[PDB]
Ligand binder design. Structure first.
Ligand SMILES: Nc1ncnc2c1ncn2[C@@H]1O[C@H](COP(=O)(O)OP(=O)(O)OP(=O)(O)O)[C@@H](O)[C@H]1O
Ligand SMILES: [Mg+2]
Lengths: 72, 463, 174, 74, 115
């Protein structure tokens, strides 16, 4: 049952594009913005205090490390 | 079955485990990347745990594997630590090479049982005027030092250190708790030039490390003192050991720091509700036992000289004396510079100190406090307009203040480092005579910077 | 907590499916979706922030294949709207609880040190029938680390014959 | 050295201290710090300043004062 | 294209937009029905944005369409504004008709540099 269910999941969706190829651990998604506070989706690789670059070329500071998002 | 970094916020850390394999509380967790270590604080179900980082808070990566020890925090102990300075983890921070012993013991034992209290109260003498007359100590006692910033408090502690070391094989130990490391280094070097480190053990928490480390230095020192007392030597009774707390208030503040982030709600001042629990845990492991005893000295800081809030309140319910230092008595040139009117001990009792010493203390309290309240009118008019009564009182009070001036045994440079350590009985004799007026005919200067009546009379005759 | 949050949804689903007798179909769908959310890969793909509720709904329909329903789709939609997708398996579990109590069946879990023979299992089924239940669902388990005996758990109800008796004697001696 | 008789006498400061200044507003704390900086013109030690939460005009004023003393060369 | 209300509390309003186009942090928003304008406040994400009111809060119903200008508040500027009394939007209230300037300047800008 369990493993057949897993295989059926791999069947009806093949790999799901590897979830966009592990969703690019070197890519952070802009989620929630308010008053200079930035919420980021993904980017598991993080230090307490990384320098955070952006498409705009500016920088952010890595402060909050969550199970789902990032507070910067 | 290794856990991983699942969420980090400032000082609070969380890890996932396989639900079958769950670490118990207070056991060390090994960062698989760095030497940093984690202590369990509470179990969050599902193999999730909450922890505090012992060491640096850098290099941390969500999803980094971490292992355990499945055992509480144990550090080496024994004579192979004397004269060495260790971290919170017991590692050589003095660059004097690794520790020599493997005798490692945990740090979260329970408080000594009720049945094993030392069945009799004891007393401790220091050979110091104001203290041994007005601040008696019980071997196993609790001592508070409040205020004092124009004088060398560390000098006072080191004097007590030489006191106990020459007085007993009972060694000494100090713990750095939010240490003003300037003063810590000064104390280190001055004990060094004293050549007295064989009876001293050093652990430092110096306002630079996650709050847990500065919390736990206290436990470290406690453990060292415990074990060292428990070494029963050739008789079945080990030495009675002495402790130095850098500051109890910083011990309170260490837990105060991250309590809320722990999910703990604030307290009446916003504090940690587990304040009293940890306080008692600390104190109840500091007592006198059937075999041996442990006492300590606590350097106390007071916020804004206010005592009417929990942070000193809880402490006071565990001390036995409140030594409150005096600034303007130092301005009066007095070496010890200790207030003679506010400091007390619960040990002032005729049954424990005898009657004569108690009543002498009573009389000196009375004369000093009466002299104080006449200061204003004396300033207004002068001695003459006062009745002839209390003129001798003024003279006696002044001579008392001079008599209290005690040259230090160990400063190495304050008056030549002369020790006094006069017997309690001789000082009793001298103060009895002074209260009677046996020598209320001599300038107070003859009583200044000296000890017993012999020195006072010799000085008065030489001049 | 999480079960508390799941409660009302279970009530609604059970009421509706019972009113349509499709309870089995919904239970199967619930097992399917629980397994689905268990997958790290499937979830991570699902939790990608660029997906409106429609994306997740149609994804669930696809992974379900030709088994869904309009009620199923509505249920999925509502849960996606409040993002309660996470606590689905607990909803399924409570739903099982509801069907069991509704059909008056009781599910019983038994662990033995040694493997069992269907004779003894039927004997125990009869015995718990004498314990006055409607019907029983037996799930056995071999537990040789247990010294011996069979331990039976019916929710809060437990009966022991294994090492626990010994633990009791030791505490008694002390 | 701080130039202020009271300061230089009653509460000295040595190379390496962590002494603190505190008080109410418009009390020359700014000015006192600046004078402290000026005093070390001949010390040979170096001096650094930070401005926090202040109108840029204030900062420019201070800088101009320092250059007027030429202090903004060390 | 256009968004619409989700909730109303006091002067704070929310608009739901398509992920294709979500307004910038400060932009003028035209309530497509009654005469009311909105200022973007936060990028609540998932096509959700939070805003503040510029007029009364009444007649407004959850779902009424609303459009963006892709531009923040810009009011007339110049000598033609002098001797006049305009509103918070630059609209005249002195009953002196429209202001004869077409120069427009936003209400937001950066602080002057130190140099
Ligand atoms: N020793 C002094 N002699 C004469 N005037 C002084 C002296 N010290 C300060 N002042 C005057 O006090 C005025 C206000 O002090 P100042 O503005 O430096 O306080 P501040 O520390 O900047 O407080 P805040 O940070 O609140 O502005 C200055 O204009 C200065 O002229
Ligand atoms: Mg200022």
């Amino acid at each position: 049952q369990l493993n057949p269910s897993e295989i059926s999941a791999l069947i009806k969706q093949r790999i799901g594009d590897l979830d966009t190829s592990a969703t690019a651990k070197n890519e952070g998604t802009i989620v929630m913005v308010s008053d200079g506070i930035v919420r980021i989706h993904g980017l598991a690789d993080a230090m307490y205090g990384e320098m955070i670059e952006f498409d705009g070329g500016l920088f952010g500071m890595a402060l909050n490390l969550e199970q789902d998002s990032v507070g910067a | 079955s290794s856990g991983r970094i699942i969420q980090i916020i400032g000082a609070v850390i969380d890890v996932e485990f396989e639900r079958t394999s769950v670490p118990k509380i207070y056991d060390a967790l090994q960062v698989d990347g760095t030497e940093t270590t984690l202590e369990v604080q509470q179990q969050l179900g599902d193999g999730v745990v909450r922890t505090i980082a012992m060491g640096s808070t850098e290099g941390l990566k969500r999803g980094l594997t971490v292992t355990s020890t499945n055992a509480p925090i144990s550090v080496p102990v024994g004579t192979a630590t004397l004269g060495r300075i260790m971290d919170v983890l017991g590692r050589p921070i003095d660059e004097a090479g690794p520790v020599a012993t493997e005798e490692r013991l945990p740090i979260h034992r329970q408080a000594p049982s009720y049945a094993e209290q030392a069945a009799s109260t004891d007393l401790l003498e220091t050979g110091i005027k104001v203290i041994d007359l007005l601040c008696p100590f019980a071997k196993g006692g609790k001592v508070g030092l409040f205020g004092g910033a124009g004088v060398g408090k560390t000098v006072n502690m080191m004097e007590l250190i030489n006191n106990i070391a020459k007085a007993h094989s009972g060694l000494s130990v100090f713990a750095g708790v939010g240490e003003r490391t300037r003063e810590g280094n000064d104390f280190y070097h001055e004990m060094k030039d004293s050549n007295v480190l064989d009876k001293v053990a050093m652990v430092y928490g110096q306002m630079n490390e996650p709050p847990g480390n500065r919390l736990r230095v206290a436990l470290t020192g406690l453990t060292m003192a415990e074990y060292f007392r428990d070494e029963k030597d050739e008789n079945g009774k080990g030495r009675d050991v002495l402790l130095f707390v850098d500051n109890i208030y910083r011990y309170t503040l260490a837990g105060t720091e991250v309590s809320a982030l722990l999910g703990r709600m604030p307290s009446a001042v916003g504090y940690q509700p587990t304040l009293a629990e940890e306080m008692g845990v600390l104190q109840e492991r500091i007592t006198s036992t059937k075999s041996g005893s442990i006492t300590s000295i606590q350097a106390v800081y007071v916020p804004a000289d206010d005592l009417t809030d929990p942070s000193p309140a809880t402490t006071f319910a565990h001390l036995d004396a409140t030594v409150v230092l005096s600034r303007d008595i130092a301005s009066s040139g007095i070496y010890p510079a200790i207030d003679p009117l506010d400091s007390t001990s619960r040990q002032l009792d005729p049954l424990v100190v005898g009657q004569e010493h108690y009543e002498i203390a009573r009389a000196v309290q009375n004369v000093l406090q009466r002299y104080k309240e006449l200061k204003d009118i004396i300033a207004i008019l002068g001695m003459d307009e006062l009745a002839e009564e209390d003129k001798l009182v003024v003279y006696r009070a002044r001579k008392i203040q001079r008599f209290f001036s005690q040259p230090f045994h160990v400063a190495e440079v304050f008056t030549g480092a002369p020790g006094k350590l006069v017997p309690l009985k001789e000082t009793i004799r001298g103060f009895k005579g002074l209260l009677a007026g046996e020598y209320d005919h001599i300038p107070e200067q003859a009583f200044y910077m000296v000890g017993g009546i012999d020195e006072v009379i010799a000085k008065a005759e030489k001049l | 907590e999480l079960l508390t949050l799941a409660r009302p949804y279970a009530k609604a689903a059970f009421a509706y499916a019972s009113e349509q007798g499709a309870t089995d179909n919904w239970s199967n769908a619930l097992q399917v979706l629980s397994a689905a959310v268990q997958d790290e890969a499937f979830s991570a793909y699902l939790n990608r922030p660029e997906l409106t509720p429609a994306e997740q709904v149609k994804l669930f329909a696809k992974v379900l294949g030709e088994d869904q329903s309009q009620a199923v789709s509505n249920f999925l939609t509502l849960l996606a709207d409040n993002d309660r997708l996470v606590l689905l398996p607990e909803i399924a579990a409570e739903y099982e609880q509801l069907k069991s109590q509704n059909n008056n069946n009781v599910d019983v879990v038994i662990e033995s040190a040694f493997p069992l023979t269907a004779e003894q299992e039927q004997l125990l089924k009869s015995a718990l029938e004498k314990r006055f239940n409607s019907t029983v669902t037996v799930s056995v388990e071999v537990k040789p680390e247990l010294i011996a005996g069979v331990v039976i758990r019916a929710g809060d109800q437990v009966i022991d014959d294994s090492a626990l008796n010994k633990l009791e004697k030791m505490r008694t001696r002390l | 050295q701080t130039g202020y008789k009271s300061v230089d006498t009653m509460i000295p400061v040595g190379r390496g201290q962590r002494e603190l200044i505190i008080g109410d507003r418009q009390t020359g704390k700014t000015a006192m710090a600046i004078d402290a900086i000026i005093a070390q013109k001949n010390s040979g030690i170096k001096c650094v300043y930070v401005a926090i939460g202040q109108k840029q005009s204030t900062i420019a004023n201070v800088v101009r004062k320092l250059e007027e003393t030429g202090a903004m060369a060390y």
